[PDB]
């Protein structure tokens, strides 16, 4: 079984993307400067001493990258900080805040490690944008390798290339391609994180469920790819054949689950697609009923947003698809998860590492057909000690929902770590992500954020690489 390679057209598009890339104003890269100590008091002094030095002409003459590399080789203590800086001025200002115990947008500082490992959040719909993943694909060999990996599997399964979609600026995403391309971006972002030493304590999903199965060791990459391919082409083909009274809209309204139970007595065909947050629910059903609940919400001063789809996932309109989905997913091999799963399919309940497999065919049918218990899964994570939530996405849509649920459960302090975002540099974003994992004491080998020194100019004249 030999997989499709990268397509001619993908190679052509890459050649063009690389030329366009080579001819742009080069930006200062974002460099992470880590400082740590057993005591916060010492960390703060270390930050101040580093600043003083970076102000000196010898400091000024050393590159941020050589300083960060040197800093990366120190003992990483329990009290930690990172200044994300593009130049010496930014680094110093940030180091000053660290020392002063003050805060600033490019600075993370904490007295000790968070107690529990991070929850990886794999959402999806709403996160897509035309150029998503393109810049990181061109600029990161590891990310690129994983995108190409998923690209082969998706070619093999559906007969087109997601890499073509990523590189081609004229192409935009639909119900089908959004799913498989975000999947690809999710897989590649996570493997990139794993490459730098990170891992999930648990996963939660809102597709994102396919990727979450992969990263939880519930399915092989192949089987996760089948899960997303099968689901996505069926939904895209179904939604395109929908016109008139067949249409079913989806919309976001500021009603709690309890509110919805009362409100729905007036709207007999509405269903819940997603419990997104304590007072935010995605509802679905016939257009006249969706507009009426929207109107009722707007009149009560509650937020309400109609989505763009002629179809309603997680409603009864999915019934015709379940047959095909069943047939198509026959053969998949559900495995025992290797990290925890908050399953938004199974009402937000938790499956332990080593537990029984969950990711059988019936799970994907159940998932497509029934409500997504997102806020419930998040609430269950908070209540079991989790404070770090890290969203693998092209745009951080789900973190805004996560914050509502964490706040509502009495966690005012949560560590909400995004990955990529539109109109934010993708390499910078990932530096920031990995910086933050480091500062909170999660697994992250900060040494791997710099290339191996080839000479002494790759170090700065500070401990532990002082020039004898
Ligand atoms: Cl040290
Ligand atoms: Cl260390
Ligand atoms: Cl320590
Ligand atoms: Cl902080
Ligand atoms: Cl690279
Ligand atoms: Cl519970
Ligand atoms: Cl708190
Ligand atoms: Cl945060
Ligand atoms: Cl290297």
Structure description:
The chain is α/β, with parallel strands linked by helices and 468 residues long. The chain folds into 3 domains: 31-113 and 447-458, Alpha-Beta Plaits; 119-206 and 208-241 and 317-424, Malonyl-Coenzyme A Acyl Carrier Protein, domain 2; 244-306, Malonyl-CoA ACP transacylase, ACP-binding (Alpha-Beta Plaits, 2-Layer Sandwich), CATH 3.30.70.250. The protein contains 18 helices and 14 strands. The chain has helices at 8-22, 40-55, 57-61, 64-72, 88-100, 134-139, 141-158, 162-167, 175-195, 209-215, 221-240, 257-263, 287-299, 322-329, 361-369, 374-383, 397-408, 426-439; strands at residues 31-37, 79-85, 107-110, 119-122, 202-205, 249-253, 271-277, 280-285, 304-306, 340-343, 349-351, 372-373, 388-391, 415-417. Strands 11-10-5-4-13-14 form a 6-stranded mixed beta sheet, with helices on both faces. Helix 7 runs antiparallel to helix 9, helix 10 (209-215) runs antiparallel to helix 11 (221-240) and helix 16 (374-383) packs across helix 17. It is globular and about 75 Å long. It starts with 7 loop residues before the first helix and ends in a 29-residue tail after the last helix. It comes from Mycobacterium tuberculosis (strain ATCC 25618 / H37Rv). Residues 119-439 are annotated as: Acyltransferase. This is Polyketide synthase Pks13.
């Amino acid at each position: 079984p030999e997989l499709p390679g990268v397509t001619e057209e993908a190679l052509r598009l890459k050649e063009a993307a690389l030329e366009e890339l080579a001819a742009q104003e080069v930006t200062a890269p974002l460099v992470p400067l880590a400082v740590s100590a057993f005591l916060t008091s010492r960390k703060k002094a270390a930050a101040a001493e580093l600043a003083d030095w970076m102000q000196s002409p010898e400091g000024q003459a050393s590159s941020l990258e050589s300083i960060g590399r040197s800093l990366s080789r120190r003992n990483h203590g329990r009290s930690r900080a990172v200044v994300l800086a593009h130049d010496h001025d930014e680094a110093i200002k940030g180091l000053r805040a660290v020392a002063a115990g003050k805060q600033a947008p490019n600075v993370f500082s904490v007295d000790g490690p968070v107690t529990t490992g991070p929850v990886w959040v794999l959402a999806g719909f709403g996160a897509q944008h035309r150029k998503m993943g393109k810049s990181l694909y061109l600029r990161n060999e590891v990310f690129a390798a994983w995108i190409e990996k998923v690209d082969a599997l998706v070619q093999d399964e559906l007969g087109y290339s997601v890499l073509e979609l990523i590189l081609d600026d004229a192409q935009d995403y639909g119900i089908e391609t959004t799913q498989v391309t975000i999947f690809a971006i999710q897989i590649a972002l996570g493997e990139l994180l794993r490459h730098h030493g990170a891992k999930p304590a648990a996963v939660i999903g809102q597709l994102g469920e396919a990727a979450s199965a992969y990263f939880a060791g519930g399915l092989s990459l192949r089987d996760a790819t089948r899960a997303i391919c099968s689901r996505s082409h069926l939904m895209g083909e179904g939604e395109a054949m929908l016109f008139g009274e067949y249409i079913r809209l989806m919309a976001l309204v500021e009603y709690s689950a309890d509110e919805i139970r009362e409100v729905f007595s007036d709207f007999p065909d509405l269903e819940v697609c997603v419990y997104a947050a304590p007072t935010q629910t995605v509802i679905g059903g016939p257009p006249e009923q969706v507009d009426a609940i929207l109107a009722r919400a707007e009149a009560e001063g509650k937020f309400a947003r109609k989505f763009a789809t002629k179809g309603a996932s997680h409603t009864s309109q999915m019934d015709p698809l379940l047959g095909e989905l069943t047939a198509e997913l026959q053969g998949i091999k559900p495995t025992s998860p290797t990290c925890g799963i908050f399953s938004t399919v199974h009402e937000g309940r938790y499956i332990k590492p080593g537990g029984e497999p969950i990711h059988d065919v019936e799970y994907w049918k159940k998932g497509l057909r029934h409500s997504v218990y997102f806020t419930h899964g998040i609430r269950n994570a908070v209540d079991s000690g989790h404070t770090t939530f890290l969203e693998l996405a092209p745009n951080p849509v789900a973190l805004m929902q996560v914050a509502l649920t964490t706040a509502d459960a009495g966690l005012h302090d949560a560590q909400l770590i995004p990955t990529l975002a539109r109109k934010q540099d993708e390499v910078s974003s990932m530096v920031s992500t990995m910086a933050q994992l480091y500062v909170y004491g999660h697994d992250l080998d900060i040494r791997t954020l710099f290339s191996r020194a080839s000479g002494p100019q790759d170090y700065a004249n500070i401990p532990p690489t002082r020039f004898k």
